[PDB]
Amino acid sequence: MVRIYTLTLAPSLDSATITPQIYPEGKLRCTAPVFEPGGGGINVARAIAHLGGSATAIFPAGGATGEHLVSLLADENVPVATVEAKDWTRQNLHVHVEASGEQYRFVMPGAALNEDEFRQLEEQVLEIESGAILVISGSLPPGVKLEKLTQLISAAQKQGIRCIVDSSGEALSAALAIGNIELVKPNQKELSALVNRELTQPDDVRKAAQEIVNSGKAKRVVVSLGPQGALGVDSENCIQVVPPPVKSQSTVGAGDSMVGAMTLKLAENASLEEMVRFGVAAGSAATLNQGTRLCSHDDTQKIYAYLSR
C-alpha cells in the first residue's frame, strides 16, 4: 500500500453548534461550539485515519485558529505538513437544528495565500515520492490563480505523483484538461456542468462518466448520486452501489469520507468495485454521525460487509 497525502489550500477550523430551531430576527440560542479540523483535504485525511489508514495533510495554517486546527489534528493522530500563513485560518459555523434534524453550513472564504506561501505549499507537494497518491480537495483560497493549481498538478504528475481532484467546477474542468487524473467524484449537477448537457435519459450519467474516462481525462470517475449511492466507471468496469436503508443524521461529511475511503482502496490497489463499495459505505457511515464527524471504522466496516454480500 502506497503513501497518501492530501492538499487543502483553504483549511477551516469548523465549529459545530446545536440550536432548538431556526427562524429570522430572534436570538437563536446555540450550544457551546465543538471545534473540529475542517477543509476538504483535511477531512479526507481524517476519514482515512478513522478507517485505520494514514494520510499526511498538507495545508497553510495561520493565527490562533490555525494553531487550534493543528492541535486538533494532533489529537486525532492525523500527520500534517504545515506552512505558516499570515492570514488567519477561517472559521466556518455548522448549526444543527434539533426540531428539524437539519444542518446549516455557513462557509466563509478561505484565508488568503500570498505568492510566497503558495510556493512553500508547492514545495511540500513536490517532496512527495513517486507513485504516492495526492488528494487535492476543497475550494481555492483568495490569492490563488487557477493556473497555478494547474501547473502544480502538471509538475506533480511529471514526477509520478498520482493526483485525485475534488474541488470547484472550474478546478475540476481544468484538472481534467491536464488529464490522467486518478479519480474524480462529481455529483450529478457537477457532471452536467462538466459536459454541458442535461442528463435526462436513464443511461446519460454512465455515458457521460465513461466518455470522461475514455478520452483519458480521468482514469476513474465515480458519480455521486445522493441517496441513490454512486456510479463508478473505469476503462473496464462499471458499478452502481446503493447504500442500505439506514438512519440519516448529518449529510455533510459524506463526500469527504467517500473520497477518503476510495483513496484508501486506491492506495491498496483494490478493484473498482471494492473502491466504490467502500466509498459508499464510508459516505453512508458519515451520515450516521454529526456533520463534522466523518465515518467511523465500525459503522463503515459493517455497511461495507453488507454492501459486499
Next chain:
Amino acid sequence: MVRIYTLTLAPSLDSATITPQIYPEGKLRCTAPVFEPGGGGINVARAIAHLGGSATAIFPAGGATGEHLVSLLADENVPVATVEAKDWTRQNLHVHVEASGEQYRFVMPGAALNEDEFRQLEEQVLEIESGAILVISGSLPPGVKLEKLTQLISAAQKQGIRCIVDSSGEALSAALAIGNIELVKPNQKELSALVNRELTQPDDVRKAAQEIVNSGKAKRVVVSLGPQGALGVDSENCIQVVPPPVKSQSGAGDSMVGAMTLKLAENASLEEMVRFGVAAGSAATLRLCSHDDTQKIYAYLSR
C-alpha cells in the same frame, strides 16, 4: 391477464393551483384551479390505463364534486363502478409555488360513508369473479370501522378474489392480520410500525419484510424506499431495484402499485413486477406514469 378492479373508500376531486410565493397570513394569489380525479384506488386505475391495461375503479361519489369526479374519469376513458353517496366527495388542494418549485398538498378527510353506502360498495366488490385482482388503496374515511374493511377482505378472499392493499397505519395492520394479502407496499416507516421496531441496521428492512411474508400475512412485500427504489420479497426470492439516475418531482406510489398490479395480473416474476413498479414510480416523478416513459425505464432496468 386476469381482470383488475380497484376500491377507493375515500376518493377525492383533486384541485391544483399555482402561486408566486408561500408565506403566512397574507392572501396568496392562486391561479384558477385545475381539476383531476384523485384517491388511491382511482389513481391506481388511471396509472394502469396509461400503461395500456384496464382496471375498473369502484368508489363512492357524492354531490356535485363526485359528479365532477365521475365526469373527469369519463373523459379519461377509465371504467368505473360508483355508489351514490350522501356526503359530498372531498376536494384536496395541491399548490405549486413558483419561487421555490415546491409543492404543497392539503389532504382533507375522505367524505363520510354510512352503512348503506359501504354495503353497496361491498356488494360491488363481491360481484368480482374468482381469480380477479382487487386493489384496495387510499385512506379510510370516517364512518368506516376497521372491522368493516377486514370483513370485506375476508369475504373477498373466501370467493377467490386476489387482494392487494396499499394503505397506512391500522388499516394495513388490520389487513395483514386477516392474512394471505397478495401484495403490500409499505415505506420504511410503515414497515417499522408494522413490526413494532426501529429498522436501522442494513439488513433490517429485508428481514422485516421477510418476517411478514413468512408469517403468511402477505405473499409479497415490496418496500418503497423513495429515491432508492424498492426492495421486494416473497416466499422464495429477494430483489432490490434502484431507478436510473434520471430527474425527480415527487405520484409515484399509486403508479408503482398500478404497474405491479398489471404485472401480477400477467403472472410476472417477482423481478419483473418490482422493476416495472420502480419504472412506473420513476416515470411519474419525471402526474402519473406515462406509457413511453415507463417503458423506456423498464427496458433499461430489464437489459
Next chain:
Amino acid sequence: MVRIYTLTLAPSLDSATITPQIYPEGKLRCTAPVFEPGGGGINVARAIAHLGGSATAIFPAGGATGEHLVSLLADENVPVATVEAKDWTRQNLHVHVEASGEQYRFVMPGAALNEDEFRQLEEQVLEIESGAILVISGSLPPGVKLEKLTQLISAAQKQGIRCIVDSSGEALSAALAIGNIELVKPNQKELSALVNRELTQPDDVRKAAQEIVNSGKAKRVVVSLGPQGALGVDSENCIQVVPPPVKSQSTVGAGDSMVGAMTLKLAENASLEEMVRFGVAAGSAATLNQGTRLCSHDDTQKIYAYLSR
C-alpha cells in the same frame, strides 16, 4: 340611523381547516373543513351583523358553492340580495398550522361575471334609497372592467347613495378619481402610491391622508397601520388609535371588520374619533381569532370600552 348595503363583486366560500405542520411534497392531513361566507363586502356585512347592526349584502352567487354561501349568510342573520351567476362561486382555503400557530391563505380568482350579471347587480345597487350607505369591498372578478365599477359609483352618487370603497390599489385610485368617497382605508404602502411619494418623516402619513381629504377625493381617510392601529383624518379632526396590548392570532379579518365597525358608526352619525376607535376595536377583536370568524360583539365592546377610557 340610515340603512347599510355592501357590494361584493367577487364573493368567496371560505373553507377553514387545521393541520399539525406545514412542509412541502408530503401529504398534509387536514381536519374536516369548516365553511364561512367570504369576500370583502360580505365580510363587512357579517361584521356589522356581529356588532348588532344590519347590512344587506349584494352579490353574485353561482352554483352549489354559491347556494352554500347564501345558506351560511342566512345562518348569520345577514340579509342578502343576490344575482344568479353562471360561473361557480370560488372556494378559498385557509389553513391553520398547529405547530407554528400560523395561517396560510390560498385565494383563488373571483368567479367570472358576465355583463348581464353585472347589469343585474348594478340594478340592485340603484334601487338603494338616497342617503343610504353602500360599502364596495373586495377584489374585482374576471369580466369586470374598472371603468364599470367607477360608472356604478357615479350612478350611485348621482342618486344620493353614500359610497365607501375598500379594494385593490388600482380600484382605490380609480374610485378616488371620481371623488366624494365617504371613507377609504389604505395601508401605508397604498397611501404612499396614492400621493406618489415616500412617507419617511414622522408626520408624513398624516399629511398624505390629509392631502387626500383636502382634494375632495375622500371625505375621510383611515390609514391602517397594522399593529400600530389606525390614523384617521377628516376635514376637521385627526386621531390615531392603537390596539390594546393583547395577542394577535391573525389579521385577515381585521380589515373587513374595521370597515364594518366604522360604517356602522357612520350610519349612526358618530364622531370621527368614535368611528376610528370602534374600527380599531373591531379590527383588534378580529385578530384574536384565526381569521374567518371576524370580530365578536363582546370582544369588540370590551376593547372599545377600554380604548375609549
Next chain:
Amino acid sequence: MVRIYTLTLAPSLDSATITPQIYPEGKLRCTAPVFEPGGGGINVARAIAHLGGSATAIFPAGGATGEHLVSLLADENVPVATVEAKDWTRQNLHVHVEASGEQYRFVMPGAALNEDEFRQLEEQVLEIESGAILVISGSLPPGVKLEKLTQLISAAQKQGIRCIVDSSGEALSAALAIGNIELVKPNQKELSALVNRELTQPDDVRKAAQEIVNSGKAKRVVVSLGPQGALGVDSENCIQVVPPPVKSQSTVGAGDSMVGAMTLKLAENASLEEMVRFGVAAGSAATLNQGTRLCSHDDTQKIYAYLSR
C-alpha cells in the same frame, strides 16, 4: 447628570456576514465577516454615546477575540473598564440573506469566568460612586450562578448605586426579588411569566407592571410592546407611547438602544413621560436602520421631538 456605568457579564464579539440563499445541507457561501462590539451592557453604553451621553462599559475580555472587542470599542470612542479573562470572548454570528432580505442571529454561550475574574469585575462595580447608575444587561455566562448576580446587586445598592437590570427570565426575576430595581424593561411574554398569569385582557399588561412596582420590586417598569411602542408605570403615573408611522427594517438593536435612552433620561432626572418617549424614540430610531445598527442621535431626536410636541 449622574455618572453612568454598564456591566456585561457575557460580552460578545459580533461577526456579521452576507450570503445569497439559506437552505439546509448545502454549503452557504458567506462573505468575509465584519465585526462589531456586542453584549447587552456594551450595546447600552454604545447607544448612550450615540445619544450624547457618557457610559463606561465594565466587562471581561479574553483571548484575541476579547482584544478585538476592546479595539472596536476604542474605535467608537466608548469608555471601558475591562478584566482580563482566561476563556476566550464568545463570537456570535449574524447572517443576512440576499434572496429574502432576512437576518439570522446565532448566539453562542458567554465565555466562562473564574473566581478571580468575577471578583475583579465586582471590585470595578463597587468602585462606582454613590448616586451613580449601573445598568446590568445581557445573559449570564455558564458558571455564574444567580446568587452571584444578586449578591453583586445587593452590594452595589448598599453603597447607593442605582441599579437597572435588563436580562430575561430567572435573572430578571431574581433581581426583582432583591427589590428596589430602578428600572426593568420586560416584553409582554417576560412580564406574563414574572406575574405568573396570561395577560389576555386589554388592561392586563398595565396591571401586571403596576403590581411589580407596587410590591417595591422595581421603581419603574417599562413594558416593550414591539411595533406598538411601550407602556411605562411608576408609583405615581402610567404612560403608553406609540412611535410615529416611520419605516422599520430591522428590530435588532431596538431593545439595547431603548434601555440606553431611558437610562440617560433617568440620569437626567427625567419625568416618566420623558423617559418612555425617549426610549420609544431610540427604539424606533434603531429599527429605521437595517441590520444590527443602534439608534443615532439625529433619528432619535427627530422622533422624540415629534412625540414630545
